[PDB]
Design a protein around this motif. Structure first.
Motif, PDB file in Angstrom:
ATOM      1  N   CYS A  64     -10.401   4.278  -0.490  1.00 41.22           N
ATOM      2  CA  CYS A  64     -10.252   3.579  -1.755  1.00 41.22           C
ATOM      3  C   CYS A  64     -11.559   3.591  -2.536  1.00 41.22           C
ATOM      4  O   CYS A  64     -12.651   3.672  -1.967  1.00 41.22           O
ATOM      5  CB  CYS A  64      -9.805   2.139  -1.533  1.00 41.22           C
ATOM      6  SG  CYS A  64      -9.821   1.177  -3.049  1.00 41.22           S
ATOM      7  N   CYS A 108     -12.698  -1.003  -2.447  1.00 43.63           N
ATOM      8  CA  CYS A 108     -12.925  -1.692  -1.186  1.00 43.63           C
ATOM      9  C   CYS A 108     -13.291  -0.753  -0.046  1.00 43.63           C
ATOM     10  O   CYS A 108     -13.567  -1.227   1.059  1.00 43.63           O
ATOM     11  CB  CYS A 108     -11.689  -2.510  -0.806  1.00 43.63           C
ATOM     12  SG  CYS A 108     -10.249  -1.523  -0.377  1.00 43.63           S
ATOM     13  N   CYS A 151      -4.227   2.248  -3.207  1.00 44.15           N
ATOM     14  CA  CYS A 151      -4.785   1.637  -2.010  1.00 44.15           C
ATOM     15  C   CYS A 151      -3.817   0.592  -1.477  1.00 44.15           C
ATOM     16  O   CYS A 151      -3.263  -0.204  -2.241  1.00 44.15           O
ATOM     17  CB  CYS A 151      -6.141   1.002  -2.302  1.00 44.15           C
ATOM     18  SG  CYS A 151      -6.864   0.179  -0.868  1.00 44.15           S
ATOM     19  N   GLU A 187      -4.260  -2.087   0.300  1.00 44.53           N
ATOM     20  CA  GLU A 187      -4.680  -3.474   0.441  1.00 44.53           C
ATOM     21  C   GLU A 187      -5.213  -4.108  -0.833  1.00 44.53           C
ATOM     22  O   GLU A 187      -5.104  -5.326  -0.982  1.00 44.53           O
ATOM     23  CB  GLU A 187      -5.737  -3.597   1.546  1.00 44.53           C
ATOM     24  CG  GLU A 187      -7.096  -3.025   1.205  1.00 44.53           C
ATOM     25  CD  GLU A 187      -8.006  -2.964   2.414  1.00 44.53           C
ATOM     26  OE1 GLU A 187      -7.482  -2.871   3.544  1.00 44.53           O
ATOM     27  OE2 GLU A 187      -9.241  -3.021   2.240  1.00 44.53           O
ATOM     28  N   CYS A 188      -5.785  -3.336  -1.757  1.00 45.89           N
ATOM     29  CA  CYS A 188      -6.238  -3.897  -3.019  1.00 45.89           C
ATOM     30  C   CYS A 188      -5.543  -3.303  -4.233  1.00 45.89           C
ATOM     31  O   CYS A 188      -5.800  -3.760  -5.352  1.00 45.89           O
ATOM     32  CB  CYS A 188      -7.756  -3.728  -3.184  1.00 45.89           C
ATOM     33  SG  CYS A 188      -8.277  -2.064  -3.607  1.00 45.89           S
TER      34      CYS A 188
HETATM   35 ZN   LIG Z   1      -8.797  -0.566  -1.916  1.00 46.73          ZN
END
Ligand SMILES: [Zn+2]
Ligand SMILES: [Mg+2]
Ligand SMILES: [Zn+2]
Ligand SMILES: [Zn+2]
Lengths: 48, 113, 57, 61, 49, 67, 56, 263, 45, 147
Positions: free
Chosen positions: I6, I9, I23, I25-26
């Motif tokens: 990513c 992050c 991504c 997770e973010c």
């Molecule tokens: Zn990310």
RNA sequence: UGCCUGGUGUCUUGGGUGU
């Protein structure tokens, strides 16, 4: 059909000992290998 | 892209002789010597050593091009002396000079150590 | 500008990537070595080679 | 995964998100934009709360 | 909403200061690609008339 | 970007004297005196330490691309 | 890698896995279900691996 | 007939005076010390991981310039002259570097002291990076912040400064003769008076200044040469001088052998 | 099959040529490929 | 005549050495309801009119990976566009050309190391890649300098 | 016996290089 084409190779003799390259031309007994270290391509015998 | 390999300055190809000698027939008892993979370091040393010999009447050298590592030397001695013998005498004499210089430097360094 | 801007030279193959000239010919070409570029044309026949070597040399 | 599922997972992790420098900067920028919007509306009550929140979130190193 | 958006974007992207269908007779070269070869070149480009 | 290992002109190793140079300048020594204390005599070497700009301290401020 | 999937709740149901008793002899437990617990975020694998899913 | 007189001696520089030799011999010795004495330097870098802000070839170039101890490099062989497939212990020295920053704050400096010798010729004192003292950290190689790691394996080979400047043992060889210009080998530019406009040479006190009534001597030749040899630490000053002399002797002996075998 | 990283992050993951470019997770829209596993050698010159 | 002589040893020690970056862009275009371009490693069998370069440096997704040395005419982005199939379905064992190559080759005169590959989506929701190549340029005969 | 590929828009505009 030149099985060593487009394969990573290492030079064991001559003025380029121990340099990693990739075989580009495989006509016969004279292989063209591009060097990863400088930006150039050199001929080399198969025995090397 | 077109830059030659740096080891070509001192690495001699197998088919290229290190030292080619051809006579110069325009004047008597003269030879032309072509040194390969050499430069001013050996040439100037040899020239200034040979210039002091009473039996050497002409000695000179030139580097044709800075991009090629070779030089050509012209030597011309008296009637009695063959030029190649004079060249050998010059080489041996410089070797002896360097040997005694090394010995004296070692002595001085040990004294001042 | 004039006919001395095109002249026929003799090839000498050398390393590195620049054309090299004796400095006496920099006057007719009005050239110096601060970045100028020059064009090279190769004859492709015996007749044309003879013309270049006998007329434009 | 689908786009909607990705958005749902991202929102879930944002709820789980304790802190992240990129996300903190984004939140502070959004708060500044909201503060200028409140300023242009002459809302003297909201702007005080937004200023307090910005002061609490800030003071970086 | 596409009218103003496309007009502004076209004029800023191509440098022709006018409507798209009147590209001829419009003042060209108003908008240029920022020169980022070195810092001084960027500073000079941002203060050019 | 970061202090060169060797002086360009002669070849003296100046890459191990950046931290000592900064320490000396911290104590109030003048630049000439600091360069003299490091035994940099030739001005070809002195220009290497004197005119070096340390840009890696600016590249390091960006968040690393991996973890 | 898969705990945040909506179907993961039914996927993990009935599964048999090695569990650390803690009180350590590892043993097998049967999943009677899962229950999300807000405010009980915990490090799953690393510090950044915050998780709210819980396994009954 | 030749004479040597040492003025100052150190591990890294020697200041000496040669006499009763030709100018050509002294200059050839200077050139040989500058560009023909073999040393040991890193010549191949295999980068297994590099997450630092510096480019891979940037760090490779920096590594190649780090001086390595080359005391016993005579016993070592050239890479192109070794019949072994790949590289053996008799024609290469393998060093390895591994640097990492732990914690989420601060900056870690990568020094040349972190280069660890892994393999090399048996019992030969070669390969170790040169250190001024036991507590000298060495040449600064890179800088790292959190989660940035540098993991490389370097191979050192034997070569001369003709091929690349990284194999040069000397830094700068000061060379000087005839401080008072009795031979008139140079003509002094001036505005008013050439004597008071030109600084005195640092060896001006070692030779008697010419007398006011002295005539020019056309029979004189340069006879005394003052030269200072500074090294990078890979080789001591005396070792550099002696090996330059030996290299010159080997070159002349090779020429002599070629001449004698030509017939 | 191929790793990715990513852009905000720095979280490693993988894609199957059919997932949306994102991504996990973010939710960042910009991702980078990971370095090759081949050997990289330089001449140190 | 405005030339200059440079010290080779200073060049060896890093004088005036520099770093060169070049970026390439490509994106998947949409031609219709279901006519889209695809990032993939094209095969000699299912695609026709391939570039004369080499496709062996491409990954599974049709993008080269960072850290790989590339030369001129090498393929750094593999892209194919669909083509209406011919009557080859007569007796071809699935080995009939349905796609046409639209790959991006490296410039013929340039070579270097793949530095960073970026993959994202454009405003329209299609795939969009950027490949940055890095090389080092050392001063040599013919390079221009100025005070 | 499994057997090797040459084929590259156009039109505008801008910024540059050598005289
Ligand atoms: Zn990310
Ligand atoms: Mg000009
Ligand atoms: Zn210096
Ligand atoms: Zn060996």
């Amino acid at each position: 059909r030149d099985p060593t084409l487009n394969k990573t190779v290492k030079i064991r003799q001559g003025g380029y000992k121990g340099k990693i390259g990739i075989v580009k031309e495989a006509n016969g007994d004279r292989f063209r290998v591009e060097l990863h270290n400088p930006n150039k391509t050199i001929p080399i015998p198969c025995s090397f | 892209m077109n830059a030659p390999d740096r080891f070509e300055l001192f690495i001699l190809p197998d088919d290229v002789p290190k030292l080619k000698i051809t006579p110069d027939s325009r004047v008597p008892n003269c030879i032309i010597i072509k040194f390969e993979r050499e430069d001013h370091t050996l040439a100037n040393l040899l020239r200034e050593e040979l210039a002091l010999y009473p039996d050497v009447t002409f000695v000179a050298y030139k580097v044709e091009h800075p991009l090629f590592a070779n030089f050509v030397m012209r030597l011309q001695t008296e009637e009695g002396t063959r030029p190649k013998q004079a060249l050998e005498r010059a080489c041996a004499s410089i070797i002896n000079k360097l040997k005694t210089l090394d010995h004296k430097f070692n002595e001085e360094w040990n004294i001042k150590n | 500008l004039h006919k001395m801007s095109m002249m026929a030279h003799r090839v000498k193959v050398m390393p590195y990537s620049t054309f090299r000239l004796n400095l006496s010919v920099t006057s007719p070409y009005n050239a110096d070595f601060d970045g100028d570029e020059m064009n090279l044309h190769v004859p492709q026949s015996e007749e044309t080679r003879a013309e270049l070597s006998q007329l434009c040399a | 995964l689908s786009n909607d599922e990705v958005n749902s997972i991202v929102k879930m992790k944002q709820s789980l998100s304790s802190n992240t420098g990129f996300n903190t900067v984004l939140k502070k920028a959004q708060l500044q934009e909201e503060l200028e919007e409140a300023r242009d509306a002459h809302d003297h009550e909201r702007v005080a709360r937004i200023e307090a929140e910005l002061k609490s979130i800030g003071a970086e190193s | 909403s596409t009218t103003i958006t496309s007009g502004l974007k076209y004029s800023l992207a191509t440098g022709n200061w006018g409507e798209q269908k009147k590209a001829m007779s419009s003042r060209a070269g108003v908008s240029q690609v920022l020169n980022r070869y070195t810092y001084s070149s960027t500073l000079s480009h941002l203060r050019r008339t | 970007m970061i202090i060169p290992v060797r002086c360009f002109s002669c070849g003296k190793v100046v890459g191990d004297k950046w931290d000592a140079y900064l320490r000396l300048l911290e104590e109030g020594k003048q630049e000439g005196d600091a360069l003299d204390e490091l035994k940099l005599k030739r001005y070809c070497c002195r220009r290497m330490v004197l005119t070096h700009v340390d840009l890696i301290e600016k590249f390091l401020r960006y968040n690393p691309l991996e973890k | 890698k898969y705990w945040y999937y909506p179907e993961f709740d039914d996927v993990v149901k009935g599964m048999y896995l090695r569990l650390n008793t803690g009180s350590s002899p590892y043993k097998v437990v049967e999943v009677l279900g899962s229950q999300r617990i807000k405010g009980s975020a915990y490090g799953l694998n690393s510090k950044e691996n915050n998780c709210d899913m819980y396994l009954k | 007939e030749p004479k040597v007189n040492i003025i100052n001696a150190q591990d890294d520089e020697v200041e000496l005076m040669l006499s009763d030799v030709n100018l050509s011999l002294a200059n050839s010795l200077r050139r040989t010390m500058l560009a023909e004495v073999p040393t040991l330097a890193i010549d191949l870098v295999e980068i297994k991981m590099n997450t630092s802000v510096l480019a891979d070839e940037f760090i490779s170039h920096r590594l190649g310039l780090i001086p390595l101890v080359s005391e016993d490099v005579e016993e070592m062989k050239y890479s192109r002259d070794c019949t072994c497939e790949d590289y053996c212990d008799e024609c290469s020295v393998v060093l390895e570097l591994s640097a990492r920053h732990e914690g989420e704050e601060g900056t870690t400096d990568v020094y040349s002291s972190s280069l660890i010798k892994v393999s090399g010729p048996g019992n030969l004192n070669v390969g170790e990076p040169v250190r001024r003292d036991d507590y000298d950290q060495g040449i600064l190689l890179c800088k790292l912040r959190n989660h940035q790691e540098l993991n490389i394996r370097c191979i050192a080979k034997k070569g001369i400064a003709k091929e690349h400047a990284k194999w040069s043992p000397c830094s700068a060889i000061a060379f000087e003769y005839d401080p008072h210009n009795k031979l008139k080998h140079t003509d002094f530019w001036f505005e008013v008076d050439a004597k008071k406009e030109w600084p005195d040479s640092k060896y001006a006190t070692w030779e008697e200044p010419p007398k006011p009534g002295e005539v020019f001597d056309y029979k004189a030749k340069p006879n005394r040469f003052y030269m200072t040899v500074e090294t990078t630490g890979s080789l001591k000053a005396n070792q550099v001088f002696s090996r330059g002399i030996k290299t010159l002797q080997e070159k002349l002996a090779n020429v002599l052998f070629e001449l004698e075998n030509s017939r | 099959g191929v790793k990715y990283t990513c852009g905000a992050c720095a979280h490693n993951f993988s894609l199957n040529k059919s997932d949306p470019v994102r991504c996990k997770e973010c939710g960042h829209r910009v991702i980078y490929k990971a370095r090759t596993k081949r050997m990289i050698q330089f001449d140190a010159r | 005549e405005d030339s200059m002589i440079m010290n080779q040893s200073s060049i060896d020690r890093g004088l005036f050495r520099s770093l060169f970056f070049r970026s390439y862009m490509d994106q998947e275009k949409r031609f219709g309801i279901s006519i889209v371009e695809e990032f993939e490693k094209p095969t000699r069998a299912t695609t026709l009119r391939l570039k004369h370069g080499t496709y062996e440096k491409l990954d599974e997704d049709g993008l080269i990976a960072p850290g790989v040395r590339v030369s001129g005419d090498d393929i750094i982005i593999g892209k194919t566009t669909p083509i209406p199939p011919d009557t080859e379905e007569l007796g071809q064992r699935t080995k009939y050309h349905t796609k046409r190559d639209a790959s991006t080759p490296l410039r013929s005169t340039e070579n270097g190391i793949v530095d960073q590959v970026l993959l994202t989506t454009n405003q329209e929701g299609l795939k969009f890649v950027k490949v940055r190549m890095r090389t080092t340029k050392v001063p040599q005969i013919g390079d221009k300098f100025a005070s």
